[PDB]
Amino acid sequence: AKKVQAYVKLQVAAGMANPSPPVGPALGQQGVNIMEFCKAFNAKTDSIEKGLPIPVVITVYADRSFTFVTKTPPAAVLLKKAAGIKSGSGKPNKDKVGKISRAQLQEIAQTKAADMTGADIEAMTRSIEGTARSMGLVVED
Amino acid sequence: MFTINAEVRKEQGKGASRRLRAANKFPAIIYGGKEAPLAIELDHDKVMNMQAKAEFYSEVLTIVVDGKEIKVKAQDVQRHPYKPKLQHIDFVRA
Amino acid sequence: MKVRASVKKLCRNCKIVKRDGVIRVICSAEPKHKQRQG
Amino acid sequence: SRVAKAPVVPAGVDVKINGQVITIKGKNGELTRTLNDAVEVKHADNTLTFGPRDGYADGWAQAGTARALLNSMVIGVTEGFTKKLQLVGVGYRAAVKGNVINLSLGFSHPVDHQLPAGITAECPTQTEIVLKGADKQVIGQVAADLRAYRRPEPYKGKGVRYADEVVRTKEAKKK
Amino acid sequence: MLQPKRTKFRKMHKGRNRGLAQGTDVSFGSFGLKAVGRGRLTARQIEAARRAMTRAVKRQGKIWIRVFPDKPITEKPLAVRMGKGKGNVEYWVALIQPGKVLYEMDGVPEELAREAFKLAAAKLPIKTTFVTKTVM
RNA sequence: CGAUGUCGGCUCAUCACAUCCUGGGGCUGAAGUAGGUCCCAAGGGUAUGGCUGUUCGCCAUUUAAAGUGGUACGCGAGCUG
RNA sequence: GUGAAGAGGGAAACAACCCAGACCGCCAGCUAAGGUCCCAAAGUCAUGGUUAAGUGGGAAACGAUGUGGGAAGGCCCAGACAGCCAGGAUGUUGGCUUAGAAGCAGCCAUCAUUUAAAGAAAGCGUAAUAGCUCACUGGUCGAGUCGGCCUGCGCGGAAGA
Numbered sequence: 001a002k003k004v005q006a007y008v009k010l011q012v013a014a015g016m017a018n019p020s021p022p023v024g025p026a027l028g029q030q031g032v033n034i035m036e037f038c039k040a041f042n043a044k045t046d047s048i049e050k051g052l053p054i055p056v057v058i059t060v061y062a063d064r065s066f067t068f069v070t071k072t073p074p075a076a077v078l079l080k081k082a083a084g085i086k087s088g089s090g091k092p093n094k095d096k097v098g099k100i101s102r103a104q105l106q107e108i109a110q111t112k113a114a115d116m117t118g119a120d121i122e123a124m125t126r127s128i129e130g131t132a133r134s135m136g137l138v139v140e141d
Numbered sequence: 142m143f144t145i146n147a148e149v150r151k152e153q154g155k156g157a158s159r160r161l162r163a164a165n166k167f168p169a170i171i172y173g174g175k176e177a178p179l180a181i182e183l184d185h186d187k188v189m190n191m192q193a194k195a196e197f198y199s200e201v202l203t204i205v206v207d208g209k210e211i212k213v214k215a216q217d218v219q220r221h222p223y224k225p226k227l228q229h230i231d232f233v234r235a
Numbered sequence: 236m237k238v239r240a241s242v243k244k245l246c247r248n249c250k251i252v253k254r255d256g257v258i259r260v261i262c263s264a265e266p267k268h269k270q271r272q273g
Numbered sequence: 274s275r276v277a278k279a280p281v282v283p284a285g286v287d288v289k290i291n292g293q294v295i296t297i298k299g300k301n302g303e304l305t306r307t308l309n310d311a312v313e314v315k316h317a318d319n320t321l322t323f324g325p326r327d328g329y330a331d332g333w334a335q336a337g338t339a340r341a342l343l344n345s346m347v348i349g350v351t352e353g354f355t356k357k358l359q360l361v362g363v364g365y366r367a368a369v370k371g372n373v374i375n376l377s378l379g380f381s382h383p384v385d386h387q388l389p390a391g392i393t394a395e396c397p398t399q400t401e402i403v404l405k406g407a408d409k410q411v412i413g414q415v416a417a418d419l420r421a422y423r424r425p426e427p428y429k430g431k432g433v434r435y436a437d438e439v440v441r442t443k444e445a446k447k448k
Numbered sequence: 449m450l451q452p453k454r455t456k457f458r459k460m461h462k463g464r465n466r467g468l469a470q471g472t473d474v475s476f477g478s479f480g481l482k483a484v485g486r487g488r489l490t491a492r493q494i495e496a497a498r499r500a501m502t503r504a505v506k507r508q509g510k511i512w513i514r515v516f517p518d519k520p521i522t523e524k525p526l527a528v529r530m531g532k533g534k535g536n537v538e539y540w541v542a543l544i545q546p547g548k549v550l551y552e553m554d555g556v557p558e559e560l561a562r563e564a565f566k567l568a569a570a571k572l573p574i575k576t577t578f579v580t581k582t583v584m
Numbered sequence: 585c586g587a588u589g590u591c592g593g594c595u596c597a598u599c600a601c602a603u604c605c606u607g608g609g610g611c612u613g614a615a616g617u618a619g620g621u622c623c624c625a626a627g628g629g630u631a632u633g634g635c636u637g638u639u640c641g642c643c644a645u646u647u648a649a650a651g652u653g654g655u656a657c658g659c660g661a662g663c664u665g
Numbered sequence: 666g667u668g669a670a671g672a673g674g675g676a677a678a679c680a681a682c683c684c685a686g687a688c689c690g691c692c693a694g695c696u697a698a699g700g701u702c703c704c705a706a707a708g709u710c711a712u713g714g715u716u717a718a719g720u721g722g723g724a725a726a727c728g729a730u731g732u733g734g735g736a737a738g739g740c741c742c743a744g745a746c747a748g749c750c751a752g753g754a755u756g757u758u759g760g761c762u763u764a765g766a767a768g769c770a771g772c773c774a775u776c777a778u779u780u781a782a783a784g785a786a787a788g789c790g791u792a793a794u795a796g797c798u799c800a801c802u803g804g805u806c807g808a809g810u811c812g813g814c815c816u817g818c819g820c821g822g823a824a825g826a
Contacts, residue, residue, distance in 0.1 A: 001436065002359070002438045010758090010795095021765085055758080075756060076758090076760095079759095088774095089773090090774095091773045092760070092774045093773085093775095112756075116756065116779090117754065117756085119780085123755090123756095123778060123779065124755095126756085126778055127755065127757095129756090129778090130757095131756055131757075131759070131776095132759095133774085133776055134757090134759045134774065135774095136759090136773095136774080165736095186735080186736055186737080187737095189737085189815095190736080190737055193737095198584070222546060223472075223484055224815085236611080237610075238611095238622060240726095240727070241821095243729085244729090246788080247800070250730095253730085256822095257821060264788075265441075266611065266612095269610085269611090271623070272728090272821065273729095275808090429615075443612090443613090443614075444615095445614090445616095447616090574726095
């Protein structure tokens with residue numbers, strides 16, 4: 001049939017929200033309460049790493065109310081920090097813009113572990129390595 | 142290696158050739174050694190798939206002609222001008 | 236539908252349906268891929 | 274083959290076995306207007322059976338046919354059909370009267386089908402038609418004549434569709 | 449386009465086909481097109497063909513092209529009563545016969561080779577058919 | 585070749601569809617709008633003038649549209665010259 | 666070779682093609698090319714098979730899951746093939762450009778896991794991502810099947826006074 005409905009997902013900064021372009025209209029269509037979420041989100045984001053873009057998934061009900069689960073920041077972002085870079089490489093694999101030690105990846109894999117399916121640390125660590133190779137970020141043991 | 146079944150042929154003539162080609166059979170000869178040539182007619186369809194592998198032209202055939210066997214090699218092949226049919230294959234006893 | 240003598244099949248969603256002597260083509264997606272004869 | 278070598282009629286319904294028709298009969302609808310043509314009549318306890326009429330080797334094209342064609346009428350007297358038939362765009366009305374349904378797409382003049390029996394019209398809305406029907410064949414045809422007032426079109430989406438949205442959408446331009 | 453650079457002679461006869469071949473086997477190639485049927489390539493047919501192949505096989509494999517056109521074949525011009533002189537060379541035809549190998553691909557899969565030749569062909573004037581490399 | 589009167593016009597048409605319009609559709613880069621293009625469709629309809637011997641063409645202004653081609657490049661035992 | 670200078674019989678009619686050279690006659694016979702459903706003389710013949718187009722009774726390039734006939738190969742009861750139940754995960758909303766183009770505008774990346782198994786991917790979709798479906802993979806069913814090949818006969822292609 002036709003229709004539409006919610007359970008939205010978005011990656012908003014740690015301590016910042018409400019802007020129309022970034023947020024607002026995005027979930028506003030579903031019928032979410034911008035104001036409430038703005039303060040609600042940034043409320044817990046204070047405890048979580050500030051200044052780090054964390055992806056949150058909002059789920060609206062018929063009540064138009066909503067709940068959201070704050071996960072861990074994207075692997076790509078985490079790699080940028082570890083590598084100390086700002087952006088990717090444009091042409092990954094061809095030109096490396098940064099590097100990350102095998103130890104760091106394990107740390108990032110441990111952070112993403114919650115959202116990763118990886119049965120063991122090796123799996124999770126590699127899962128991110130695939131993201132690094134896609135960012136043009138080399139990894140030295 | 143393949144162990145081909147083929148059989149005596151006995152009429153020389155282009156015409157008779159045309160008659161053979163109306164069946165799958167194409168005329169063909171064994172010649173070699175100290176005994177006069179053996180006019181056989183192998184079956185195309187078998188031999189088609191068998192000559193498609195390199196092995197044919199490379200290892201020994203043993204052409205079973207009515208109950209006896211003669212070990213030959215396929216040397217030369219005068220096939221149809223443009224069709225995957227054969228018309229002829231010369232076989233030298235080696 | 237789009238009319239030519241031949242243009243074969245066009246994608247993997249081109250089923251080729253024969254209604255009469257002409258050979259039409261149903262397509263899931265594009266109506267421009269639908270042939271009357273092609 | 275497959276279907277054409279598959280046999281099934283429950284004991285929820287009833288039959289009038291005949292040598293040149295396959296008749297089902299019962300309540301909620303009934304009566305069978307598809308008939309033998311190229312197929313035998315055998316029977317079974319739990320199946321109204323038929324292999325191909327002999328002296329014709331192509332009769333299993335007509336048989337695999339005959340198969341789904343019989344069983345569907347049975348589904349019609351046990352369960353509804355033609356479940357709904359929506360339409361994209363609005364102010365396109367309804368009527369739902371004696372068996373006529375009006376619908377507008379800028380029709381000054383009324384557009385109606387005095388429907389046969391064995392197919393029902395209902396809606397709650399001016400964007401929807403909710404029909405339960407019996408006899409998948411019968412119904413389906415008269416059902417088409419409705420939505421066929423105007424075809425759906427891709428450049429604004431509007432035009433009476435089906436139940437499900439199976440349109441293509443092409444952007445408008447020049448704005 | 450393609451012709452004798454030093455001409456043996458200017459003009460030549462109609463010629464006849466007697467069909468068949470002896471030229472039936474790739475010797476540079478591993479895939480190829482042979483003929484079915486008989487005709488002429490006017491060499492703008494060779495040219496179109498060399499082109500269509502190259503755009504497809506790319507800079508993988510290599511191409512050879514058996515038959516180079518050697519019979520002129522005249523056309524006597526328009527609006528003059530016929531039989532007053534023999535015409536002038538407007539062509540270089542290539543008399544081709546069945547089983548006569550046209551072109552020759554190498555270096556690329558059996559399927560690529562077919563669907564490069566299938567693409568060339570139609571800009572060829574007769575029915576074709578595939579060649580496999582062949583042990584011989 | 586023991587005469588089959590040329591072109592053009594006029595007059596009178598008639599046929600074919602490879603359709604210009606109307607009719608019915610497909611696709612559309614199908615917003616609408618008029619269209620573009622193609623398919624089906626010959627029932628009916630399908631322009632006057634200016635110039636030029638030319639048919640044609642070019643130009644002017646409409647028209648729903650001023651189709652194309654065939655009929656001894658239609659028609660002189662019907663007209664014109 | 667015939668016609669010329671040859672009738673006759675066949676090819677509808679049809680100087681030349683095919684068959685056959687008319688001394689003459691006979692409500693005589695036997696054949697020939699070619700024919701035997703009716704016009705219109707003789708098989709609604711026998712046997713077997715093919716074709717569905719009115720092909721037969723005009724045409725090619727070329728296209729096709731139309732059919733018949735033949736052979737091999739790939740997969741298959743340790744359950745294939747299709748659909749359906751689904752897998753469709755996870756890293757994953759990667760970069761330039763653009764707030765945001767982050768598989769799929771263009772350009773680059775075209776890797777890898779989770780596993781029993783799951784392409785940074787064919788297209789739709791979106792400026793672009795997100796999502797949907799698919800060559801890609803798991804389950805249900807229950808028996809042959811999937812593409813190529815040779816080859817007989819068809820189909821379209823096939824529009825004019």
